[PDB]
Motif scaffolding. Structure first.
Motif, mmCIF file in Angstrom:
data_model
loop_
_atom_site.group_PDB
_atom_site.id
_atom_site.type_symbol
_atom_site.label_atom_id
_atom_site.label_comp_id
_atom_site.label_asym_id
_atom_site.label_seq_id
_atom_site.Cartn_x
_atom_site.Cartn_y
_atom_site.Cartn_z
ATOM 1 N N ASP A 23 2.616 5.181 -8.415
ATOM 2 C CA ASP A 23 1.350 5.038 -9.116
ATOM 3 C C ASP A 23 1.115 3.567 -9.415
ATOM 4 O O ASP A 23 1.854 2.983 -10.221
ATOM 5 C CB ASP A 23 1.349 5.855 -10.408
ATOM 6 N N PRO A 24 0.117 2.930 -8.798
ATOM 7 C CA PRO A 24 -0.077 1.487 -9.011
ATOM 8 C C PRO A 24 -0.379 1.106 -10.451
ATOM 9 O O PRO A 24 -0.092 -0.031 -10.839
ATOM 10 C CB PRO A 24 -1.253 1.150 -8.084
ATOM 11 N N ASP A 25 -0.943 2.008 -11.254
ATOM 12 C CA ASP A 25 -1.318 1.651 -12.620
ATOM 13 C C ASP A 25 -0.091 1.409 -13.492
ATOM 14 O O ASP A 25 -0.016 0.404 -14.213
ATOM 15 C CB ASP A 25 -2.197 2.748 -13.220
ATOM 16 N N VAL A 26 0.879 2.326 -13.450
ATOM 17 C CA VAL A 26 2.067 2.192 -14.289
ATOM 18 C C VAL A 26 2.878 0.971 -13.877
ATOM 19 O O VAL A 26 3.360 0.206 -14.724
ATOM 20 C CB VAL A 26 2.909 3.480 -14.228
ATOM 21 N N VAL A 27 3.049 0.769 -12.569
ATOM 22 C CA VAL A 27 3.803 -0.390 -12.109
ATOM 23 C C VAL A 27 3.055 -1.677 -12.429
ATOM 24 O O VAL A 27 3.673 -2.689 -12.769
ATOM 25 C CB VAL A 27 4.117 -0.267 -10.607
ATOM 26 N N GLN B 61 -5.285 -1.727 1.179
ATOM 27 C CA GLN B 61 -6.596 -1.483 0.589
ATOM 28 C C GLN B 61 -6.494 -1.069 -0.872
ATOM 29 O O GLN B 61 -7.452 -1.266 -1.626
ATOM 30 C CB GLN B 61 -7.367 -0.437 1.402
ATOM 31 N N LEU B 62 -5.358 -0.504 -1.292
ATOM 32 C CA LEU B 62 -5.130 -0.281 -2.715
ATOM 33 C C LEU B 62 -4.892 -1.581 -3.470
ATOM 34 O O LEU B 62 -5.167 -1.643 -4.672
ATOM 35 C CB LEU B 62 -3.945 0.661 -2.925
ATOM 36 N N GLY B 63 -4.382 -2.612 -2.799
ATOM 37 C CA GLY B 63 -4.237 -3.910 -3.429
ATOM 38 C C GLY B 63 -2.941 -4.635 -3.127
ATOM 39 O O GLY B 63 -2.865 -5.858 -3.266
ATOM 40 N N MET B 64 -1.914 -3.896 -2.713
ATOM 41 C CA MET B 64 -0.616 -4.496 -2.455
ATOM 42 C C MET B 64 -0.657 -5.343 -1.184
ATOM 43 O O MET B 64 -1.586 -5.266 -0.377
ATOM 44 C CB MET B 64 0.458 -3.415 -2.344
#
Ligand SMILES: O=c1ccn([C@@H]2O[C@H](COP(=O)(O)OP(=O)(O)OP(=O)(O)O)[C@@H](O)[C@H]2O)c(=O)[nH]1
Ligand SMILES: O=c1ccn([C@@H]2O[C@H](COP(=O)(O)OP(=O)(O)OP(=O)(O)O)[C@@H](O)[C@H]2O)c(=O)[nH]1
Ligand SMILES: O=c1ccn([C@@H]2O[C@H](COP(=O)(O)OP(=O)(O)OP(=O)(O)O)[C@@H](O)[C@H]2O)c(=O)[nH]1
Ligand SMILES: O=c1ccn([C@@H]2O[C@H](COP(=O)(O)OP(=O)(O)OP(=O)(O)O)[C@@H](O)[C@H]2O)c(=O)[nH]1
Ligand SMILES: O=c1ccn([C@@H]2O[C@H](COP(=O)(O)OP(=O)(O)O)[C@@H](O)[C@H]2O)c(=O)[nH]1
Ligand SMILES: O=c1ccn([C@@H]2O[C@H](COP(=O)(O)OP(=O)(O)O)[C@@H](O)[C@H]2O)c(=O)[nH]1
Ligand SMILES: O=c1ccn([C@@H]2O[C@H](COP(=O)(O)OP(=O)(O)O)[C@@H](O)[C@H]2O)c(=O)[nH]1
Ligand SMILES: O=c1ccn([C@@H]2O[C@H](COP(=O)(O)OP(=O)(O)O)[C@@H](O)[C@H]2O)c(=O)[nH]1
Ligand SMILES: O=c1ccn([C@@H]2O[C@H](COP(=O)(O)OP(=O)(O)O)[C@@H](O)[C@H]2O)c(=O)[nH]1
Ligand SMILES: O=c1ccn([C@@H]2O[C@H](COP(=O)(O)OP(=O)(O)O)[C@@H](O)[C@H]2O)c(=O)[nH]1
Lengths: 159, 229, 229, 229, 229, 159
Positions: A23-27, B61-64
């Protein structure tokens, strides 16, 4: 009051939020917290787990070999380490990822002297792949890393 | 009529069941199919995917960053390779796993000659970590590995019985690379299909879930879609 | 203004002078150009080709196996990489050679993070052995390396003044990937051009032999052909 | 009667035809000769030279560093080894290539016990990269390899009919190491000849290009020059 | 006047004290000498011998096979290298041990470029396992290593103050390789001296036991015997 | 009555005779005994020690690092393994030496499946380099090897 060398124990929940995956938000928010503490003038070594992907007990219950299950778990830990490295680099931080499993193209091999050199240079150390051997826990790896790199304090993330 | 060397391309759906993670039942049935085709007396190299864990373009595309996203995807590919190896060896099949990213404690490095020898010894040669390079896919990994090990065919294992004229439709039987390019079908990625067409490698898209489909395709029965030239 | 990170791409002509073997004069010229560019304060990764020794396609046409021919070509690329490293060390420039095929005694294994760190430390990062896999080429190697290290531009070094509209008569200045594909221009091969277009890496085709051209291109002067997004 | 284990020594002329590069006809002739010798039931380890590509001494005279020149020469030897392996596989002969410089993807690391086992199993054991160290030569490589594997003879393959008393006019038949040293004959370089004399390994200098000469020499017929203890 | 890069050849007597095994006091004093010369600001590569454990010729004449005898001798060399590394690191000196026989858990493999970098970083580069090849000696190992790392001098550390005209006698001061060959002295083995003379490498035979002798030789004081050209 | 798979524990005394080094007479006679038992139709795996060269306790008393001392001891074990292999080959016996430390040019890496294959082929297995890790004894290595390769009996040499 405060510390100088802190070992942050991150689990798979800190990268998944309860759901399997990343989950990109928590990280991102934990990376923001690490950025705050590192700009506060502290040395940070983060030992990362892989519960968001796999666990040896669950894979053994499914019926797989313990060694293979632990290697898959360590690979998951390395993936979480790469994700945290990316999110920390998004905030202008120099990070060094060390994996106990020698994967030179991905990261650098585990070396306590190199780790303490990176800590003294201000870089954030990211310990993945656990201890590189089967039948070990990430808490045990955290204790070993703290005792080896001379980390004065150990802090475990909580949900 | 018949293939002696097959390179089975298994996408991430074949391990995740369409979800994220690992599905023991789908991996078990794929392992059963591979064991049946091995006991049939065929040399099989299985190229693993990692779409059930991560995709480089999706994370970008998510940002990474694309590089770290690709490395995470390749590590997921290695994890799926290990799972498939465990499930295959639970059935008495001798499997050798090779990764293009050197991790000695996990698997032996990529030695094409040793992989060919393993094939000649009746062992399943699992290929993980893709080609070990970012900005690439397991489709072009499969194409390159099949070309290098001199495989007879590339068996694309999908959930559908073959390629169609348009996604929901007529299911084609035997096409050519030029016809696929003209019709704008979906057999593989752009780079993968370009390499496969330039080197004239036969592809066979088929539904692996249907029991015995891989065996029929290996024996030469006209099933699925055969992209030849 | 200008490019801070360049991935130079040298073909077998840059080491053989159009013949088979090794011409020390051309390598000395290339070393001088790279040395002055580095003295200008630029991060540079070179990618070596081995056409002056062997081409896998030509050897396959002769009759040899394509995989072995490709490995011989990659070894030739490593040899040219060592020659360039020698001629650059003659100019007092610190160089780090990385080979895709792991040969620790000769050079170091391909580590992209180590390569970018060497670029930061002012060292020319030379890439040999291509990407380590058969059926590929040094153009694809250059594209992938530039994408992975984060190079700002890909500098294709040629013996002519950039891309022309028709090989012998007009000299182009600036184009796009789609324009090159439509007009059928020759910049790289199909796979490398496809990857570069899909990722949008700028390409600058220019004559390296002419003195100062690479320095001008790094500074940002309009020379050669600029294939941009 | 005759030799059961031979260490053939091929120079750069056997792969370049006296020129720079690779001549497929000469390699095909060498492959046919080795193939018929193996069909005769003989254990054979070949040692490859890279004079058709590079000589470290000549490159040092040109101006390059001796160590880098030697590594380039060893890589050229590995390339010629791969070419010979290809041409031998064309004749249905099983070959195992070992390189002194560890390059696992290209060949296997130099393991003498594995090499002698491959000799027992009827496989031609090819040696590339020399001994893996600069300032040495393929003659020293051949002497050391023959001593270590236990080869009965060292077969120096040349384009002439053995060692002569004076290079262009008498053709010698049988001599000793001390006799060669006294008369100032040319068999190998100083280091290789010293090692061979100190260990007493028999040498047979003969013309490999002439059809059947290597088979006759293995059977024990009097051809070329026999330098014995 | 003065040497910046020294290759100290330490025979097995320097670790065994003339006996069989390991003498802690002799190794301690050798380590003290090396530490003093390192703190003097010199780049030192120490080539280890294994005569205090085994010799290939001695075991061969006793009855054992030469190959296994040589491998046992090289393993003894590695053991002495480890002992010297431990004693040097007991004094605060940074030492990197490289073995020509790949044993990853024991020491890093032989990487000449990394060894040169270690020398430039002010680290003692220990060379064990000889050259990793049977039918060779630590003398020619030292010659080859000093030639490859570009050492300024080869310091032969013996128990006597230098070479004499005849074993018990006049102690010579400055000689040439040709003069040594004519006079039949004892500087090194035949192959080692041949290589060293052909490549023009300066040798300095001196008594290491006398405190400060190595420091004087490095600084350029005329002590011991200097074999130059 | 008798056995089929025997693990012979050889110590440094069996290669030195009390004196530091290698005594060809003792190793030759033990090789003769092994030749007798292998021609008697038995499978033999010999686990070899290195007391004739070094011991971790003695090196620690001298003042060296435990890891380095144990690696030197394992190297001594490998040397003894090579000597025994030579003396067994002098009697027309096919022997396979496996070292827990990966030295490919000297011997082959330790693999229990390869070891049992060699035993079933009549070749004599020679286990050197101990267990490949510091802080272990050759008796412990012998027990582990016997349990892994399925050796039905363990016999220790005596002086
Ligand atoms: O590092 C390596 C190891 C092996 N190889 C290549 O692997 C191929 C065989 O790998 P094997 O190790 O199977 O050799 P083998 O065929 O002799 O096996 P056995 O007969 O003992 O059962 C050989 O062609 C070798 O060159 C490499 O290319 N690199
Ligand atoms: O085997 C390796 C070693 C290093 N690396 C990665 O290469 C990058 C640079 O590795 P370097 O060691 O070249 O730079 P460093 O900054 O890490 O050490 P100093 O130069 O400050 O002495 C680091 O990010 C490291 O993780 C690898 O990926 N693999
Ligand atoms: O890495 C290695 C592997 C093997 N060897 C040594 O090579 C020799 C042959 O190794 P092989 O594996 O080629 O023959 P094998 O007889 O040992 O197995 P089979 O052919 O019966 O299947 C054996 O003596 C082994 O110890 C090495 O020295 N290093
Ligand atoms: O496997 C290897 C590793 C390294 N090398 C060679 O080692 C030399 C340096 O080895 P280092 O690893 O010291 O590189 P570095 O000099 O960049 O060290 P830092 O700046 O990070 O302190 C380089 O010239 C490299 O090519 C090899 O040849 N092979
Ligand atoms: O040194 C180590 C580190 C990790 N693991 C395995 O890694 C997997 C995932 O790690 P953990 O379960 O410790 O992750 P957390 O619960 O901290 O998320 C588990 O199967 C562990 O056995 C292991 O075997 N050894
Ligand atoms: O050679 C390779 C193989 C895989 N990947 C990465 O791993 C991911 C998983 O591979 P793919 O997407 O090809 O797997 P599938 O969805 O076909 O199972 C890709 O998206 C890439 O980011 C890569 O970079 N290079
Ligand atoms: O990843 C790679 C890069 C290069 N090559 C081989 O390198 C040789 C020469 O490279 P190229 O043809 O790219 O050189 P140029 O024409 O640019 O001089 C060819 O035989 C290719 O097969 C290869 O096999 N894989
Ligand atoms: O152990 C070795 C064997 C060969 N070479 C190099 O191999 C190249 C060509 O080998 P040679 O001169 O022995 O070939 P020939 O003259 O027999 O064709 C020379 O530059 C040598 O330096 C080397 O450096 N080390
Ligand atoms: O490159 C090498 C180095 C050493 N040895 C073996 O190891 C023994 C010890 O080396 P030396 O006799 O050169 O050591 P010193 O007596 O000079 O200490 C030699 O006799 C050889 O049998 C070898 O075969 N090759
Ligand atoms: O798995 C192993 C095998 C051996 N050794 C070391 O090897 C040296 C010599 O072995 P031992 O003392 O066991 O030999 P023995 O007494 O059987 O002759 C000792 O320092 C041990 O610690 C070790 O550390 N781990």
């Amino acid at each position: 009051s405060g510390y100088s060398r802190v070992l942050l124990k991150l689990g798979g929940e800190m990268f998944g939020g309860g759901q399997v995956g990343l989950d990109p938000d928590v990280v991102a928010q934990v990376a923001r917290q690490i950025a705050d503490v590192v700009r506060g003038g502290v040395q940070i070594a983060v030992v990362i787990g892989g519960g968001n992907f796999f666990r040896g007990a669950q894979l053994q219950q499914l019926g797989m070999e313990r060694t293979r299950s632990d290697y898959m778990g360590m690979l998951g830990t390395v993936m979480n380490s790469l994700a945290l490295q990316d999110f920390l680099e998004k905030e202008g931080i120099v990070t060094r990822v060390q994996t106990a499993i020698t994967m030179g193209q991905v990261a650098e091999p585990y070396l306590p002297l190199r780790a303490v050199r990176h800590l003294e240079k201000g870089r954030v150390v990211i310990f993945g792949a656990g201890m590189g051997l089967p039948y070990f826990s990430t808490d045990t790896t955290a204790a070993q890393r703290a005792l080896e790199i001379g980390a004065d304090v150990v802090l475990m993330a909580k949900a």
